[PDB]
Amino acid sequence: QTSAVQQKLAALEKSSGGRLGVALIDTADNTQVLYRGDERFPMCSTSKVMAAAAVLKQSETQKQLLNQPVEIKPADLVNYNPIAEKHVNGTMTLAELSAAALQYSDNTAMNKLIAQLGGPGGVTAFARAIGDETFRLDRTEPTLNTAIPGDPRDTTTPRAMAQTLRQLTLGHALGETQRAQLVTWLKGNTTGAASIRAGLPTSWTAGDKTGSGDYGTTNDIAVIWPQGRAPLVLVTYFTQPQQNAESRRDVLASAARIIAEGL
Ligand SMILES: *[B]([O])([O])C1=C(/[C]=[C]/C([O])=O)C2=[C][C]=[C][C]=C2S1
């Protein structure tokens, strides 16, 4: 079956020239609204949520883990490191690295989270431990952003990421303290105002993590608190056929608007 909302999303996709993936979970009734929900998309920086969450899980059995210093060396700097570059030849704690990765999309910070987990497979292993059989992280920053069409590396599906984001932020995949910390970090994101949030009524609140890569890959995953109703989880993935395609955050905003108007 094709709903009115799915038809609107297909029309948006057609006009955009790219490939759009959407998954909504409305926690009022647990109903789902999917568009290419089982197709794979490159996650790009949206994978930072899984890495931060995996470190939060580790911290449940180590009260001091988040205060643990990690050395930042000149050689650790990658392609986008607005926070880590300030701390080169010094240290950042795992909490500081998590906050930098989530709220500023700092790529050096992400690489330190990955290293703490023993490599990209450590992030995948955490995903499996919380019931996500779809997520895969194969590479570090910045190569996890190559976003080559048909490449399964560093991909997930909208359905899988929406389910996982729900379990992490609203469910019991993490301890209560850790879930709260994750929600706090997402709510303080600095990079999200042009993406999912731009399509939502201004009265609503949300936390999100954006992503961008090659092939004009433009992503956002959000937990949303709409005025006067139960929270939503929304993931919007978008990727384009040319390697050097421009970002299209407006497409994500449009998808979010269609979803909101369909409630
Ligand atoms: B992530 O791996 O998508 C990367 C981001 C940030 C994504 C976002 O949505 O802010 C950047 C930003 C600048 C240069 C490289 C990367 S990788």
Bond from prior residue into 142 cis (ω within 30 degrees of 0): yes
Question: What is the number of other CB atoms lying within 10 angstroms of the CB of residue 35?
Answer: 26
Nearest-atom index, ligand 1, CA of 211: 9
User: Which residue's CA is minimally distant from atom 9 of ligand 1?
Assistant: 211
Nearest-atom index, ligand 1, CA of 220: 9
Residue type present at position 156 = T
Residue 41 CA, chain-centre distance (Å), reads 12
User: What is the Cα gyration radius of the chain?
Assistant: 17
From residue 241, how far is each of 14, 99, 213, 244 by CA, in Å?
A: 13, 32, 12, 9
Method: X-ray
Task: Give 13 Cα–ligand 1 centroid separation in angstroms.
Answer: 23
Nearest-atom index, ligand 1, CA of 145: 2
User: Which residue's CA is minimally distant from atom 4 of ligand 1?
Assistant: 45
Residue in the block written with tokens 């919380």:
130
Cβ atoms of residues 227 and 204 within 8 Å: yes
Residue 45 annotated among the catalytic residues of the structure = yes
Pocket, ligand 1, Cβ cutoff 6 A:
44-45, 79-80, 105, 107, 141-142, 145, 191, 210-213
- Nearest-5° angle of CA 3, CA 9, CA 14? 125
In the chain, which ranges are E strands? 19-26, 31-35, 41-42, 69-72, 90-93, 155-156, 205-212, 218-225, 232-239
SS3 state of residue 210: strand
Domains with residue ranges and CATH for the chain: 1-263 (3.40.710.10)
**Pocket mutation for ligand 1, best pick of 41, 43, 45 (most atoms within 8 Å of C-beta):** 45
Question: What is the number of other CB atoms lying within 10 angstroms of the CB of residue 217?
Answer: 26
User: Which residue's CA is minimally distant from atom 7 of ligand 1?
Assistant: 211
Catalytic position from the list 16, 45, 47, 212? 45
